[PDB]
Ligand binder design. Structure first.
Ligand code: SF4
Ligand code: SF4
Ligand code: SF4
Ligand code: SF4
Lengths: 89, 89, 89, 89
């Protein structure tokens, strides 16, 4: 595989929105256990299985995808935020 | 009936999760018609017969119930969202 | 990952102990609100933040852990029983 | 100039160590801006001016050098990783 470029509009650690929504690009380092959102055990929760992850957003790759709660941005498929909600598959 | 107080955690219209899920407290003013989700004729679709409705959520009353897609929140039994799926059993 | 699948010794709904101790593997469906045990808001209480949860137990996973009040069995990190107690440390 | 021979042991995108280090062989496609590591503006950071680049590594050339954090591998002088540190001297 070729290296996966990091989008200029990916949510960053230094963004007020990320701080507000407790988003972390790496779910393993997130507060998912402390949040204890309902749906899946906490350590299985990440953007890849969240209701708001948008696979068809401008600039999306299999590593970077959109989120309906972060307009005009891109989150990491391995991330997590406190709005994590199991996708109604 | 008596004037029933609206729960402090009822899903509000200007909540980003609500906007993304296309939830309307009133099914009769919702996108159920245009969406024509499978299961039942659109005019019959509301949270009361949705699979994700949680009748025994904390604080639920005969008018406000929980929803798997709105952790910690309460929705109206006569509401609807783009996630509506006919309840089985 | 795989679907929710309780290991061999997961406390079961028709286990006399479970019934006696008011345990439910899903805290959002338990009597935590009615019981209103002291320490934290009832809706914030679950096995993961209970003093009796034991991280080091046979067959334990990120989702299933031991509980000192259920010797030899496993409970869900998202569960709750009427013995929920503050996590001292 | 003649074509720059690539090494078979170049760090590759699907190497767990590369992923963990946030390495990208093309720094302009990396997370350096988001990382905002100290010493130089993000846009000026690459392996060529990193403290850990190892010029005297087996098979190292004009374009590929070693890195203390990647034993037995070679990085691209134009690359970058989240361990970038301005070289002193
Ligand atoms: S809302 Fe879902 S998709 Fe968006 S950042 Fe949070 S966990 Fe990821
Ligand atoms: S998912 Fe079902 S219960 Fe929840 S808001 Fe939508 S229609 Fe109502
Ligand atoms: S005592 Fe604590 S760990 Fe054990 S079942 Fe009850 S709430 Fe869970
Ligand atoms: S540590 Fe320095 S030399 Fe090694 S990959 Fe990172 S930036 Fe390049």
């Amino acid at each position: 595989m070729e290296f996966m470029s990091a989008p200029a509009n990916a949510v960053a650690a230094d963004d007020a929105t990320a701080i507000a929504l407790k988003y972390n690009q790496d779910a393993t380092k997130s507060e998912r256990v402390a949040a204890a959102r309902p749906g899946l055990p906490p350590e299985e929760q990440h953007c890849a299985n969240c209701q708001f992850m948008q696979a068809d957003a401008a600039g999306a790759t299999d590593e970077w995808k959109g989120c309906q709660l972060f307009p005009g941005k891109l989150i990491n498929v391995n991330g997590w935020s406190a709005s994590w909600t199991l996708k109604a598959g």
